[PDB]
Design a binder for this molecule. Structure first.
Ligand code: GLC
Ligand code: CA
Length: 572
């Protein structure tokens, strides 16, 4: 198997969130014709590959990640031929398109589940994970173990009609597929994978790629949150006994028969296990998204915020950037997606118009200099920040936000201080900041819809919008376009370059080198603080020439880095 890999290795991915990108018929929901009408705009950002988030038939409990039919399209997004049209419209403009592959679980409204839960004698019973109840010391009915769902509460839902519990790592409406059942494997391969590979898509975003295979004895998860009864089982379900078997099967049967790229969500903590997923040798998948970088400012399982430790951040960047050049694997880099808070709000300053612009360019240098495939999320190019403090919790429509807040309200019996702390946490890292409609212009709802949007449009939209940034040479959008042109022109060091960290102990400035095997080497310095810091490039590079600064080359002062200034130098 000799393949065309350069297109995914060097390509820039733009992630589209169907519900929030563009509404073409004023019902307040985004749709496929809206996407088709904005494809020229996507191309103009610098995009090679479009990553469409789940658009298939779904009750929208988890906004597309609970699928009720792999072969049909969610009616508000448009018709089945609208989906085929989008694939062609992308292709017409030189854009590839990848779909979201959600196969750890299905909707509870999927016909496969309606059959599974119907009776214990049903032919498709074993297609999902059913377990009998356990009884505690005092005779009460309890689940098979302490596993917690990622959205709160136990991971086992009680089906009274069949007196048995079904496994659900996500919502009660997302029952987990039993991957031990070969008949269910074939059903997924045919409907969720080969059906769309046969319609000409260029690849998939594989969800929760580590958790398909559960250990046969479903043992209690470890005490990750001291003294709490239920425990998230991510650490014991990740890379299960059949996981690599499954990925190997998906490659030989589907991925290897088409010219595509596969990107998996979730990576192991070690290099040798990570290479078991992405090494060319292995013929499984091409690259992985790691949660490490996104986890520097919060701990999801404990719903706690924390200050970013500069040295841990550097070690996290190096942990995965080390795959490029020293191995036959690959890696990715991203600061945003549908499951995260806005990047300028979490990693830079969003306080003022000037700060939003300076921060957008700052993070742009951080991402542009990282090796591996680069991923942008709709909005990131124009510096959309997080929803401000004045937006109340009722507007946070995401199920993860509602379940957490409700669990605080229940477990603390409306402790008002606990609710304020729960809201503060949600204001920094909720998934809702990434789902507020795309900001196109300064008209009603930032020109996203003529109707009433399905979720609140960020109220900074009059300042922050595409049309405002299009003809402004100094906008974050035109900075993003230039930095991607720079990235392609210097791909030997930016895309394929080996990364090495210098001045490790420095807590204010991150300094690293990107070296090609051709010879060429760049040095990147980022001042993550908001005060001027003394910085001397000559202590880390014999000879150097400034190529670009995020604050403007003429504003760069030798012997210092300005607040949130990132610089690229050619050295050696
Ligand atoms: O499908 C359940 C969850 O897993 C997926 O990986 C998605 O990225 C996330 O948005 C979703 O809530
Ligand atoms: Ca619509």
């Amino acid at each position: 198997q000799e393949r065309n890999t350069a297109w995914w290795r060097e390509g820039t991915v733009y992630q589209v969130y169907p519900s929030s990108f563009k509404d073409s018929n004023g019902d307040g929901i985004g749709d496929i014709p809206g996407i088709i009408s904005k494809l020229d705009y996507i191309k103009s950002v610098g995009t090679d590959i479009v990553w469409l988030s789940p658009h298939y038939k779904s009750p929208q409990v988890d906004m597309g990640y609970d699928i009720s039919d792999y072969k049909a399209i969610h009616e508000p997004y448009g018709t089945f031929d609208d989906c085929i049209k989008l694939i062609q419209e992308c292709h017409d403009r030189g854009l590839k398109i990848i779909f979201d592959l959600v196969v750890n679980h299905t909707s509870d409204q999927h016909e496969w589940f309606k059959q599974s839960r119907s009776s214990k004698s049903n032919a498709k019973r074993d297609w999902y994970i059913w377990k009998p109840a356990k009884y505690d010391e005092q005779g009460n009915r309890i689940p098979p173990n302490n596993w917690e769902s990622y959205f709160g509460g136990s991971a086992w839902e009680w089906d009274e009609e069949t007196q048995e519990y079904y496994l659900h790592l996500f919502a009660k409406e997302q029952p987990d597929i039993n991957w031990r059942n070969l008949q269910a494997r074939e059903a997924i391969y045919k409907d969720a994978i080969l059906f769309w590979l046969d319609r000409g898509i260029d690849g998939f975003r594989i969800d929760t790629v580590q958790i398909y295979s559960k250990p046969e004895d479903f043992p209690d998860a470890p005490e990750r949150v001291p003294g709490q009864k239920l425990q998230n089982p991510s650490i014991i379900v990740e890379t299960g006994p059949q996981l690599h078997e499954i990925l190997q099967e998906m490659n030989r049967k589907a991925f290897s028969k088409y010219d595509i790229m596969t990107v998996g969500e979730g990576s192991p903590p070690s290099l040798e296990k990570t290479l078991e997923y992405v090494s060319s040798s292995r013929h499984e998948i091409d690259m992985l998204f790691s949660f490490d970088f996104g986890a520097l400012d919060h701990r999801e399982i404990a719903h706690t915020l924390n200050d970013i430790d500069m040295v841990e951040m550097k070690e996290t960047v190096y942990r995965w950037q080390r795959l490029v050049g020293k191995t036959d694997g690959w890696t990715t880099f991203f600061l945003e997606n549908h499951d995260s808070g806005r990047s300028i709000s979490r990693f830079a300053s969003d306080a003022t118009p000037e700060a939003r612009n300076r921060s957008t360019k700052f993070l742009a240098v951080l991402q542009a200099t990282m090796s591996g495939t680069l991923y942008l999320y709709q909005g990131q190019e124009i510096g959309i920040p997080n929803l401000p403090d004045e937006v109340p919790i009722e507007e946070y429509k995401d199920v993860n936000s509602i379940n957490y807040y409700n669990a605080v309200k229940e477990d603390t019996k409306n402790d008002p201080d606990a609710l304020k702390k729960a809201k503060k946490y949600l204001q920094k890292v909720a998934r809702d900041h990434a789902r507020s409609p795309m900001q196109w212009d300064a008209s009603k709802h930032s020109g996203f819809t003529d109707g009433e949007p399905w979720m609140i449009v960020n109220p900074i939209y009059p300042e922050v919008n595409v049309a405002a940034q299009e003809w402004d040479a100094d906008s974050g959008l035109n900075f993003w376009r230039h930095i991607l042109k720079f990235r392609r022109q210097h791909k030997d060091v930016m895309v394929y370059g080996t990364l090495e960290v210098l001045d490790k102990e420095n807590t204010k400035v991150f300094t690293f080198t990107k070296a090609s095997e051709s010879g060429r080497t760049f040095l990147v310095a980022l001042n993550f603080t908001d005060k001027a810091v003394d910085y001397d490039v000559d202590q880390f590079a014999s000879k150097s020439t400034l190529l670009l600064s995020s604050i403007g080359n003429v504003h760069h002062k030798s012997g210092s880095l300005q607040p949130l200034e990132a610089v690229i130098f050619e050295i050696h």
